Structure 1
Amino acid sequence: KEMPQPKTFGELKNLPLLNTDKPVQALMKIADELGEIFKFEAPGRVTRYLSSQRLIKEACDESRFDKNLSQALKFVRDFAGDGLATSWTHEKNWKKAHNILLPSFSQQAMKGYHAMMVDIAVQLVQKWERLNADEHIEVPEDMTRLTLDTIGLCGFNYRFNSFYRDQPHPFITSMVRALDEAMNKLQRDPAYDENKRQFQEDIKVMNDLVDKIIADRKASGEQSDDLLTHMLNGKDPETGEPLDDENIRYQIITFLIAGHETTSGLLSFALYFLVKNPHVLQKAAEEAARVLVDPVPSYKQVKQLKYVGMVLNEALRLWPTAPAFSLYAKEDTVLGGEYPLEKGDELMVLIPQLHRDKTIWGDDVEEFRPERFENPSAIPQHAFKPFGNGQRACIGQQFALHEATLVLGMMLKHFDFEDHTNYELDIKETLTLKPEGFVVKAKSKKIPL
């Protein structure tokens, strides 16, 4: 009982606290002051921000709590539709799409995506080895080029060709602008018709590209090793039905958003933490050299990169790029023996604060020590949740980690890195997290592909 609450803004309750360009970080500073739980009030909504493993492992009880759509996820739904990430658990299309798409995302399904992932990974390596002396690397921009191109090629055999462009592909231009307007609608129509006309024009740009690609593949009949094939041929064992063409569009849009932007933040945060801790970079570089013995990494070689994975896990601990998820109480219940919640009450899991629970991780929560994950079974349950919870956890988790391990093992194998600007960490907030302005210099090790 007696739940804390931050300062109010008259009739707006706590909403202006999110009237800032780093609201997740602002919410972490509140959680540092107010503790394990605090109520957030806005006009028309009330939520509770959870920050401790003690409270979150109860919220992760799927028998008592189910996934809720946050205001951010509801606004994305205006173009992501009933895709996996923006649908309710009880909606017929979630379980339908979920069952069709799990065999395509398994760890054994990555053996087929591997060849296409190396296609994009080589493009990144070759861009950096074609730089001139004293030229630097814009890390998140090149990381976004690789993650967006990877899900496009593996998901529906489409080449955005991001490494041939300065300005992004027109699809990604509108997608980011739709995510931009969705995020701005949170802390927000007197003078918004321009904003809305731009919003609907960006949705039509996205829908047209995907709908032609689905129409092209069906008419051509060509079969590939991409998700688009599994969706046209896959049939849900429960209902016996396949996904209709509209849902397929929403899933591809979902994979393009939910894929690239969170997965490039992981690589950007990983490389940042590697150049800020030279001892960790050396251990990771030693493994990349010993394991990746061929000019072209194999699926089995990527799985042997244990320390690269621990580097990735510890980067996901300090700065998880999909930083929060929402839950609602399925019935009346009591949280932590002290916080009564009524049916339908909402919870928010502040993932970066969970990953700083000192009673779980010790006192050095802010230090980058990948050795925490040396034994993955030792970590308590529901203490480390960068990929959500339960059946509503990330379906592309094995995808994102295999790509990030392959690319990081390749960057560490082929290049020496220099934090030539002594970069000060500046985290940009969209729907995800990215280290803005992060640049490095790469000194090629002259190992051919």
Structure 2
Amino acid sequence: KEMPQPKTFGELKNLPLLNTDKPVQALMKIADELGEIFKFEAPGRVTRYLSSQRLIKEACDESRFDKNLSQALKFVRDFAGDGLATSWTHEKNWKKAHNILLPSFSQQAMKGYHAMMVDIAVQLVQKWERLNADEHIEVPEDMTRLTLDTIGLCGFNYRFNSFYRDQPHPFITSMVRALDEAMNKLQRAPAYDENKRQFQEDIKVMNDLVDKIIADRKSGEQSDDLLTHMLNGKDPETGEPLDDENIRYQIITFLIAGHEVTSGLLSFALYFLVKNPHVLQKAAEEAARVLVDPVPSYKQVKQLKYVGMVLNEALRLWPTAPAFSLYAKEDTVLGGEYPLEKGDELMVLIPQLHRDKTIWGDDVEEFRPERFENPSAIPQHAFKPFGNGQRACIGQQFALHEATLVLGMMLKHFDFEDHTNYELDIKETLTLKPEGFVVKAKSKKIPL
């Protein structure tokens, strides 16, 4: 009944614990000492970090808990607005955009996005086959190039052409810097006057590009992208279409939730593959037996079951969206021993949930894709890499299909060597990525 709490720092309480370049991993270490739940206190804020399936399965009860905007999401809201990810459930614009955007994110809608995904996937395979001998691949940098171009091509029919650059796009320079400042606000309290001047200067860069792209599209030209469905799609409930401001926030949202959070999955997947040669060969075998054409089809991607198992296990150990927030709708008791008042907040520490030994056994730290041989064997609310309930990831099928195609083509065309014996170092922005992860790719000389 008495909830533990980590070390305090006087008037700042537990806030200095977040003053670190790896906060998610720090909360994971705190969870190992304190267990399934611990109270976290800051000046003006209190939250409870959940780590066990026993309690998270209760927090996922939508009749008792709703999505809360964490302090990180409130800072992203300053440029993501009332987009799908940074809006409240009770706000009119969430349910409106949710109803309009569900058909464009279905598994059957991935058939229309497949050709543009293959476009960017071919550019990645061609870059790696044009490398010289002893040259290495910067894995997270190249995965971000692919993911960002994929969502740009599939979402707005816009080509960032990341494979033609070493310096990033002027849009994401402002974006990644706005995400950095938003994360740096997490552990605060004239000195930061420059930060604020740069923050609004970075917000205007994102708004002007998207609003110009929206105004340019509105030629009347159609396409198979997210952009067309938002100009002509109407919410069945209210009958209304999204206004011009909201569509801008959705595009910014899809670009953030697109590029490196999805690429982190590919980077972690490739890392765990080259660290487990048995799994690598088994996944490479499936890529060769299934992808029999120079260009993979939509059906062939769906046949890569073991590649999806590899992607699901990489999401287990290192989910790139490492947590989400919930608040109590009413007075309730959590786990029969932790009474919660209305409005009290919860945190779902996803990497810890996926390390519940009572769910996955003693071998939680091993990269074993065979845990996902049969999805019905996994308990309820034990695997939550994409959120929960109606507030779950709407682009889950987008990210999984894109990652399955690219990983299958990567395993089909290249042998991969961990030439540096990479020591895992997880860089923490708002997401997780293996910093400095490099590999060598000996081509298999299979043409496209």
- TM bin, normalised by shorter chain, reads over 0.9
Moved more, 183-192 or 62-71: 183-192
User: Superposed, which structure 2 residues align to 1:129-140 within 5 Å?
Assistant: 129-140=129-140
What are the superposed Cα offsets for residues 220-279 of structure 1, whole Å, 9 maximum, x if unpaired? 110000000000010000000000000000000000001112100000000000000000
CA distance in 1, matches of 2:188, 2:201: 20
Q: Give, in whole Å, the separation in 2 of the partners of 1:59 and 1:288.
A: 39
Give the distance between the partners of 2:261 and 2:254, measured in 1 at CA.
11
In structure 2, distance between residues paired with 1:89 and 1:189: 29
For 1:98 and 1:77, the matched residues in 2 are separated by: 17
The secondary structure found in structure 2 opposite 1:186 is helix
Matched residues in 1 for 2:192 and 2:24: separation?
25
SS of equivalent residue, structure 2 residue 376: coil
Q: For residues 291-341 of structure 1, what are the alpha-carbon distances to aligned partners after superposition, in whole Å with 9 as ceiling and x for unaligned?
A: 000000000000000000000000000000000000000000000000000
* SS in structure 1 at match of 2:441: strand
Deviation track 1:163-200 (CA, whole Å, cap 9, x = no partner) reads 00000000011100000000001111931111000000
Per the normalisation by structure 2, the TM-score is 1.00
Q: Provide the secondary structure at the position in 2 that maps to 1:325.
A: strand
Q: 1:199 to 1:279 in 2, by over 3 A?
A: same
Q: Aligned partners of 2:214, 2:318: CA distance in 1, in Å?
A: 35
The C-alpha deviation readout for 1:40-99, integer Å capped at 9, x for no partner, is 000000000000000000000000000000000000000000000000000000000000
Q: Are 1:226 and 2:225 an aligned pair?
A: yes
SS of structure 2 residue aligned to 1:148:
helix
Q: Deviations over 1:329-368 (max 9, x none)?
A: 0000000000000000000000000000000000000000
Large movers: runs of 4+ above 3 Å: none
Give the Å deviation of 1:146. Answer: 0.3
5+ long unaligned stretches in structure 1: none
Structure 1 counterpart SS, 2:134: coil
How many pairs are equivalent?
448
CA distance in structure 1 between the aligned counterparts of 2:27 and 2:189, rounded to whole angstroms: 27
User: What secondary structure does 1:421 align onto?
Assistant: coil
In 2, Cα distance between the equivalents of 1:132 and 1:337? 62
CA distance in 1, matches of 2:199, 2:84: 22
Distance change >3 Å, CA 181–CA 296, structure 1 → 2 = same
Residue 128 of structure 1 pairs with residue 128 of structure 2: yes
Provide the rounded CA distance (Å) in 2 between the counterparts of 1:115 and 1:170: 26
Measure, in 2, the Cα distance between the counterparts of 1:106 and 1:65: 26
Give the TM-score of the pair, scaled to structure 1.
0.99
Map Cα deviations across residues 367-399 of structure 1 (whole Å, 9 max, x no partner): 000000000110001000000000000000000
Structure 1 counterpart SS, 2:104: coil
Q: Deviations over 1:116-157 (max 9, x none)?
A: 000000000000000000000000000000000000000000
C-alpha distance in structure 2 between counterparts of 1:288 and 1:321, whole Å:
24
Match of 1:251 in 2: 250
Superposed counterparts of 1:344-423, under 5 Å: 344-423=343-422
Q: In the alignment, what sits opposite 1:216?
A: 216
What is the rounded CA distance, in whole Å, between the counterparts of 2:106 and 2:259 in structure 1? 19
- SS of 1:377's equivalent in the other structure is helix
SS of the residue corresponding to residue 283 of structure 1 reads helix
Q: What secondary structure sits across from 2:40 in the alignment?
A: strand
Question: What is the alpha-carbon distance in structure 1 between the residues aligned to residue 260 and residue 41 of structure 2?
Answer: 29
Secondary structure of the equivalent of 1:104?
helix
Name the counterpart of 2:95. Answer: 95
Q: Partners of 2:197 and 2:36 in 1: how far apart?
A: 42
Q: Distance in 2 between matches of 1:184 and 1:350?
A: 20
Whole-angstrom distance in 1 between the partners of 2:189 and 2:8: 24
- Once the two structures are TM-superposed, the CA of residue 102 in structure 1 deviates from its matched residue by 0.2
Deviates more, 1:116-125 or 1:184-193: 184-193
For 2:168 and 2:194, locate their aligned partners in 1 and report how far apart those are by CA, in whole Å: 23
- Give the Cα separation in 1 of the matches to 2:319 and 2:185: 23
Distance 2:208 2:291 in 1: 41
Cα distance in 2, alignment partners of residues 186 and 355 from structure 1: 25
3-state secondary structure, aligned to 2:339: strand
**Partners in 1 of 2:19 and 2:46 — Cα distance?**
17
Taking the aligned partners of 2:231 and 2:417, their CA distance within structure 1 comes to: 46
Alpha-carbon distance, 1:162 to partner: 0.2
Report 1:179-190 matches (<5 A): 179-188=179-188, 190=190
Q: Distance in 1 between matches of 2:154 and 2:111?
A: 12
In 1, Cα distance between equivalents of 2:59 and 2:82: 24
Q: 2-side partners of 1:414 and 1:64: how far apart?
A: 49
For residue 430 of structure 2, give the secondary structure of its aligned residue in structure 1.
coil
Distance across 2 between alignment mates of 1:87 and 1:369: 36
Q: Which residue of 2 aligns with 1:284?
A: 283
Establish whether residue 238 from structure 1 lines up as the match of residue 217 from structure 2. Answer: no
Which whole-Å CA distance do the structure 2 matches of 1:284 and 1:375 have between them?
17
What percentage of residue pairs aligned between the two structures are identical? 100
State the SS of the aligned residue for 1:62. coil
Rounded Cα–Cα distance in structure 1 between residues aligned with 2:7 and 2:432? 25
SS at match of 2:377: coil
How far off is 1:400 after superposition? Answer: 0.1
Alignment partner, residue 173 of structure 1? 173
For 1:350 and 1:200, the matched residues in 2 are separated by 31
